Symmetry: D2
């Protein structure tokens, strides 16, 4: 199975697989059963921002999810990623709907990587930033039902013309260039990603969530991973 | 064939195709016969730095090659890339040798692309920076005799165990991800590239030179482009 | 007197001192009489963005001004800044009103400069970004009627409580740290600036205009420099 | 007196006040007695690099010191700077000597701070980078014995014309512009500092050390702060 590390903004509580009793954010290290979660007072219809950060010095993966004129949800977890992931990988966004549905619209997404070597003045880096997505976004690998072009937006899951969310949908978007997330001769290794999203749904129960993941270069949507599996995992183990 | 826009650091005057009677810097737009050139005091054996800059406000492509504590060659040329290049491209470095030879070593490469829109805050950007190339640089498409790893450098053309450069070689290095070089809805489109090189030669006259180029995504070393054609053009028209 | 290089967004045509008969943008080199201008379809009450760039290779200062979903104004002038300004300067914004008035609101502002000497891999740089101004901007030198914190914006010229602008006002804001605009061993110097502004007036004839400027460390508002002189020049010669 | 938060590179073990019996990297918070430390195998003579990192999500100040192909010391400590420093501060470097001396040469320095807000797309930032120090560095407030220009480096304490370092010397360097280290409603606040240094003593006894410090804007060298106090504190309490 693919090797995956995610930060999930989980909107539907699936109590049978470990989800707490409310919408929340969590750190996923190779399984959908989060290794750490925090309550998140989601706000249907309002644009929000996610901030993920990690540095090899204190070895902690941290996320913050907020809405304007409202409080933020924070989560942090100690993890030596150079002990869980391959040297090179691909980074991306994933999302889904099961029985219940929502829009998993992405307004912007930026990411930065930096490997600073032992030898002075020898850093290597990658930085991209999309504040507008085109119809044919030739630098993004779109998987599942993901599309770009709708008002310069990136729609991870399926949507009807009328603007209605669909169920049992799954879609992901991966940046085209393989990233060198870690390296042995690197003194400091770090990365950061930011995206603004807009989850909006007609139900009284939106499902299922959006997630930012780091995977292997050849990763693909697993079979039947809609709904509770966020298009990331093959099973809820 | 492929569309090419390049900045050539020509070490050998092929006066039969327009080359001036001395090693020069030139701006090639769809042809090996430069639109504008400038004398360059090719200083064999040492490390030089090149800087390429372009912005759509004043539509001027500019270059500057300089050696430490010495003179700088410079060239500019007004060109509206929108008219000459496809919206999406790949960028990269090329180099070749012929009857005569030289080592075409790259010690670091940088690039930045930006698309600022009419809409406030909307800006799309890409930036990569290599200060050390590994033996398996997975984010670089190595074409020809080009290889990475040696002293952490990128060798564009074939060199021997001792260090001696071989004639009639052709290598290329294209960054893996496609670049959105322009967009109609952008108020400002720009790019800057920088790279340090080391050209050495046992010959009384080295050849053929290094080049930075913007080409269509599916480009490759054309057939018979050794020597004077710098691995970029099919013929010499 | 002070040395001033500026890009002016002139809203009131004072034809007597050499002004087009419509709102314009222009390059001001040590004088209020522009060396080059461009017609500006100034929109009342709309938030606009001004982008200014400059590099020592092509030696050309350019500026674009645009409103979303509409046309753009571009202007360029060839000038060697090292033959005009001191090696160390201070950058800033300036605005004024006279017998006629308008609000000169700055919503955001960012700047970047780069000095790259002949010594390979050596670069000095400065960059700031303000996306909201607080009532206590300790890193800005405010002059004249200029104030910050007002709704998170920077008010260059005096306004009222209900909003209404006052005439015969002049204000300026400069970044605290002195900028090293050029030097001896420089291979390439360049700066880029961006600011979003809001201009609205009760009278169907606004005035006078906003301007981005570079000046010597010790620069203050000239005497009687309201109106047509945009708080930058001592006289109209 | 002034409020200090510093990361010290302590070359001399003053056990009588807390220094471990070996050189070390330590994290000081309003006191010369480090809250945390980590053994450091200082390497008299060769160039090193320190990298400080901090963010408000995990409220952890971390640092790494390394030399090429050698042991890198690391230190981290959980601390909420927002509950210790003013919103506006000044960042700088500091070094000192006493009965025993050393060279406290800074060859380069870079800093970056970002204030991300709950209100989306409203970030503020300051970033400077010095790769070559000038004889008249106007953007640096030089205090004590600090001087620039010597071979393009920054000398924090006194060295003779021949190069021999002088005891009982103390100097500082602070960036000219105040830094907004935190605002009451920022969702994320983070900074990163990097510098390369050369410390060498023509005898087997170096002292006293170099330190990156954050203080109130009006900070000035405390009296008798040489030697063991590193030019930061008025006493060893
Ligand atoms: O009413 N219920 O008790 C109840 C309804 C649906 C349910 O699961 C379905 O819908 C969820 C939300 O869309 C997904 O997480 C699941 O993967 C599956 O698609 C489970 C319980
Ligand atoms: O001595 N000569 O008159 C003379 C020598 C070599 C020559 O061309 C050959 O070598 C060049 C440099 O290596 C290449 O650019 C050409 O493509 C070809 O491989 C032409 C004339
Ligand atoms: O319409 N007019 O006949 C007319 C009215 C006023 C005028 O000059 C005044 O107002 C201008 C606009 O504020 C400023 O540029 C001048 O500095 C001065 O303050 C010139 C012509
Ligand atoms: O002989 N010794 O073992 C010995 C020599 C000097 C000494 O203290 C002095 O020198 C230190 C190093 O410069 C400073 O840290 C102190 O502040 C003081 O100025 C203590 C013991
Ligand atoms: Ca769930
Ligand atoms: Ca040639
Ligand atoms: Ca006017
Ligand atoms: Ca000590
Ligand atoms: Mn969950
Ligand atoms: Mn040529
Ligand atoms: Mn004018
Ligand atoms: Mn200590």
């Amino acid at each position: 199975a693919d090797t995956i590390v995610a930060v999930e903004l989980d909107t539907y509580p699936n109590t049978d697989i470990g989800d707490p009793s409310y919408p929340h954010i969590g750190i996923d290290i190779k399984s959908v059963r989060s290794k750490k979660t925090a309550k998140w007072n989601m706000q249907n219809g309002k644009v929000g921002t996610a901030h993920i950060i990690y540095n090899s010095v204190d070895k902690r993966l941290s996320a913050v999810v907020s809405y304007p004129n409202a409080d933020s949800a924070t989560v942090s977890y100690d993890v030596d990623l150079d002990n869980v992931l391959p040297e090179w990988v691909r980074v991306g966004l994933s999302a889904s709907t099961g029985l219940y549905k929502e829009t998993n619209t992405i307004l912007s997404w930026s990411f930065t990587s930096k490997l600073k070597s032992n030898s002075t003045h020898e850093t290597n880096a990658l930085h991209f930033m999309f504040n507008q997505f085109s119809k044919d976004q030739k630098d993004l690998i779109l998987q599942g039902d993901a599309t770009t072009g709708t008002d310069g937006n990136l729609e991870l899951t399926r949507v009807s013309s009328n603007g209605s969310p669909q169920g049992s949908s799954v879609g992901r978007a991966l940046f085209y260039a393989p990233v060198h997330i870690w390296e042995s001769s690197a003194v400091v290794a770090s990365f950061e990603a930011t995206f603004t999203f807009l989850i909006k749904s007609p139900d009284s129960h939106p499902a299922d969530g959006i997630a930012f993941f780091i995977s292997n270069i050849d990763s693909s949507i697993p079979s039947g991973s809609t709904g509770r599996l966020l298009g990331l995992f093959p099973d809820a183990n």
